[PDB]
Amino acid sequence: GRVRDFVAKLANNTHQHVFDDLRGSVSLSWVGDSTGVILVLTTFHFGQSKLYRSEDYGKNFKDITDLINNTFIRTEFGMAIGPENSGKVVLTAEVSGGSRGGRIFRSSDFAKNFVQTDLPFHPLTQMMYSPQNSDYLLALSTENGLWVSKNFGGKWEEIHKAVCLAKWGSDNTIFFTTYANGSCKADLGALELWRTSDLGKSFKTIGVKIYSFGLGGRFLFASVMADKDTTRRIHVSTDQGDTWSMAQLPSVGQEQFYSILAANDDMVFMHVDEPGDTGFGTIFTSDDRGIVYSKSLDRHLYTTTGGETDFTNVTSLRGVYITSVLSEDNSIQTMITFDQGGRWTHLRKPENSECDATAKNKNECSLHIHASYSISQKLNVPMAPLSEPNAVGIVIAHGSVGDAISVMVPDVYISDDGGYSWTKMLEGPHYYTILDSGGIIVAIEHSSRPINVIKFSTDEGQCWQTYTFTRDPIYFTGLASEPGARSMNISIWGFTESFLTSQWVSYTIDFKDILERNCEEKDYTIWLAHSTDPEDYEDGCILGYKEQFLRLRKSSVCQNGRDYVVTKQPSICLCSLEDFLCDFGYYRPENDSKCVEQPHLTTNGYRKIPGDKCQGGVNPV
Amino acid sequence: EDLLSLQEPGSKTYS
Numbered sequence: 001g002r003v004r005d006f007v008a009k010l011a012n013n014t015h016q017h018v019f020d021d022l023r024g025s026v027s028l029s030w031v032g033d034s035t036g037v038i039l040v041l042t043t044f045h046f047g048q049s050k051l052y053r054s055e056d057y058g059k060n061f062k063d064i065t066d067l068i069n070n071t072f073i074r075t076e077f078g079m080a081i082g083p084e085n086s087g088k089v090v091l092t093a094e095v096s097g098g099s100r101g102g103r104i105f106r107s108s109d110f111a112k113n114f115v116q117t118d119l120p121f122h123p124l125t126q127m128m129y130s131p132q133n134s135d136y137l138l139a140l141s142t143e144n145g146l147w148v149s150k151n152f153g154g155k156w157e158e159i160h161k162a163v164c165l166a167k168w169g170s171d172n173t174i175f176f177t178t179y180a181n182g183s184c185k186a187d188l189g190a191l192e193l194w195r196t197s198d199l200g201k202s203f204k205t206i207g208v209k210i211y212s213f214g215l216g217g218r219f220l221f222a223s224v225m226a227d228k229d230t231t232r233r234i235h236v237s238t239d240q241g242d243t244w245s246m247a248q249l250p251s252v253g254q255e256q257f258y259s260i261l262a263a264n265d266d267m268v269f270m271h272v273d274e275p276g277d278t279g280f281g282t283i284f285t286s287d288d289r290g291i292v293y294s295k296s297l298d299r300h301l302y303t304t305t306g307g308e309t310d311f312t313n314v315t316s317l318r319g320v321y322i323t324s325v326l327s328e329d330n331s332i333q334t335m336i337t338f339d340q341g342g343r344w345t346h347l348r349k350p351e352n353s354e355c356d357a358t359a360k361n362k363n364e365c366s367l368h369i370h371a372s373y374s375i376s377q378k379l380n381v382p383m384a385p386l387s388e389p390n391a392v393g394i395v396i397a398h399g400s401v402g403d404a405i406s407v408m409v410p411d412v413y414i415s416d417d418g419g420y421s422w423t424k425m426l427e428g429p430h431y432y433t434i435l436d437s438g439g440i441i442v443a444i445e446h447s448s449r450p451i452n453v454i455k456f457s458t459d460e461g462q463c464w465q466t467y468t469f470t471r472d473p474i475y476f477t478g479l480a481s482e483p484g485a486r487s488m489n490i491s492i493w494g495f496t497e498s499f500l501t502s503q504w505v506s507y508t509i510d511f512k513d514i515l516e517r518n519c520e521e522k523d524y525t526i527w528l529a530h531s532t533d534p535e536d537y538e539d540g541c542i543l544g545y546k547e548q549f550l551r552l553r554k555s556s557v558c559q560n561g562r563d564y565v566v567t568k569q570p571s572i573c574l575c576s577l578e579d580f581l582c583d584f585g586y587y588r589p590e591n592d593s594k595c596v597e598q599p600h601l602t603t604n605g606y607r608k609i610p611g612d613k614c615q616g617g618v619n620p621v
Numbered sequence: 622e623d624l625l626s627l628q629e630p631g632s633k634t635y636s
């Protein structure tokens with residue numbers, strides 16, 4: 001199954017741009033959505049920078065380096081793109097040794113024109129925008145001062161002098177911590193937490209003896225040292241710190257740490273490292289209040305305090321997560337949960353693959369997925385798992401079949417129903433991407449030699465076709481596309497083979513003439529999610545309700561468009577004893593589902609799991 | 622240290 005006469009259609013829609021400059025490093029930023037503005041910041045070493053801007057989704061670039069008047073730019077901070085569609089860009093330059101303060105070039109019209117200003121300080125961290133109003137900024141100077149600007153960098157005012165860390169809250173509220181004696185390092189565990197809703201006109205103290213703090217959605221977390229030991233607990237507040245309540249989590253020591261893996265408006269995933277350097281921890285899941293925590297998974301993988309973990313939220317399907325556990329022999333394995341952490345199991349084996357050497361039972365093995373950790377160990381894993389919210393039930397990732405993550409060269413596997421079933425898509429490492437909300441997928445081979453071919457499929461990784469886009473192969477470096485997976489333009493970077501003097505290059509391909517027609521009512525089928533056993537009266541009812549999507553058929557070759565929005569039709573299910581969790585003074589006996597009592601606020605009975613929308617039936621207070 | 626806040630992505634970089 002293949003379409004014909006696509007070679008000419010793709011040939012007409014191909015644009016090459018070559019950058020004449022020394023090969024240093026590159027940085028790519030997208031300014032807004034639906035504008036097609038791309039800013040490329042080239043740097044080389046001494047100090048020298050070049051700035052390019054494209055207003056056509058990357059088909060053509062212009063040299064606007066003279067706007068910033070040929071001044072070296074600090075790439076450590078990076079470009080500070082404004083939130084949403086505001087087109088605010090701020091750059092930080094390098095100043096001489098006798099400078100009073102730093103210097104920034106600021107634009108508010110999608111980088112059409114830049115304005116130069118001199119700061120009264122030396123910013124030591126990237127500028128931060130207020131989510132509710134982009135005109136506000138804050139930064140920390142080298143002397144740990146806190147400077148806040150209310151007119152987009154025109155003027156700044158110092159509102160404190162010993163700030164360790166700061167960050168915008170909600171509704172233009174600022175939370176920051178301060179120290180008194182010594183630096184912020186030697187004074188750890190004896191800090192204070194401050195809040196100010198008037199942009200530093202009136203302050204307030206909301207905590208003491210703090211060890212760290214952070215924002216996890218509609219929660220405020222602060223790790224407080226114990227009064228007489230080195231053990232530190234977790235305190236959580238949801239009133240902007242007005243009132244705090246102790247969380248029901250173990251008190252870790254000084255050699256351990258916490259870590260938020262994913263924080264919604266209702267649930268939060270917490271990781272608690274076990275004592276010792278064994279290299280694993282545990283996962284707890286909270287309730288709607290963010291106070292009561294129940295154990296979810298054990299022997300979770302976490303390299304170190306600054307290390308990496310394989311936890312992954314599958315955005316395509318509701319309540320699906322994937323993570324790596326640690327076995328008894330230190331052999332990593334992959335687990336998946338569909339109940340938002342209720343149960344974990346192995347990934348289903350592909351129905352048409354053979355187990356590798358890692359599997360002792362040649363008729364019994366499972367699929368395992370490479371992730372951040374595998375990339376850390378320097379394996380052949382060009383990319384991590386990919387998934388888009390607007391492409392329903394699609395997941396792509398490298399993996400191997402067996403009883404443990406192997407070290408051989410991995411293949412690529414794809415699932416088109418959320419993760420229940422998989423199948424081998426390509427052989428060998430690749431760089432993959434999704435365009436037009438799952439309309440067309442593209443892939444580039446991962447090789448050590450120049451490549452001049454790109455593959456693409458229109459039936460969700462079923463039929464693949466090869467297009468030769470360049471006559472001169474280039475060393476591939478990466479793919480770029482508009483965030484959100486709703487465009488049809490794809491940019492292919494790299495650098496030419498020129499041995500005497502190499503150069504950068506980019507090829508942009510537009511698939512407007514491949515998807516000639518626009519999808520209609522007929523080009524859609526009704527699909528039920530989480531369906532396992534049709535016999536069930538409430539088949540595929542997760543967290544109390546079902547959902548019936550309308551998904552584009554694989555055979556249908558058509559364009560969803562930029563205005564496509566997924567369709568759904570939820571229906572609730574009767575409640576049961578499995579929709580509730582335990583309260584402070586109760587626990588689940590083993591081999592049963594009831595919540596009995598264990599051998600200040602008070603609780604009576606059970607609690608309804610966050611995200612659950614069932615109604616009717618069993619209701620144990 | 623404790624990672625109590627989600628770290629959003631950065632910027633695409635090459636070399």
Ligand SMILES: *[C@@H]1O[C@H](CO)[C@@H](O[C@@H]2O[C@H](CO)[C@@H](O)[C@H](O)[C@H]2NC(C)=O)[C@H](O)[C@H]1NC(C)=O
Binds near residue numbers: 262264265313318389
């Ligand atoms: C896992 O990812 C999914 C998909 O991005 C998240 O679902 C979204 O959650 C936000 C925040 O509450 C909602 O505004 C969206 O409507 C959700 N989109 C859906 C369900 O398609 C989900 O929150 C993430 N999970 C966690 C625990 O962070």
Ligand SMILES: *[C@@H]1O[C@H](CO)[C@@H](O[C@@H]2O[C@H](CO)[C@@H](O)[C@H](O)[C@H]2NC(C)=O)[C@H](O)[C@H]1NC(C)=O
Binds near residue numbers: 056057488
């Ligand atoms: C891919 O890039 C092209 C330009 O190369 C985008 O074209 C824009 O299309 C919109 C919607 O019709 C027009 O209003 C704009 O004027 C076009 N831009 C230009 C510079 O002319 C195209 O939209 C991109 N792909 C998708 C799927 O939108």
Ligand SMILES: *[C@@H]1O[C@H](CO)[C@@H](O)[C@H](O)[C@H]1NC(C)=O
Binds near residue numbers: 069116
């Ligand atoms: C541009 O930079 C040069 C560097 O020598 C400086 O002399 C000049 O004043 C700058 N121009 C403007 C308009 O700021």
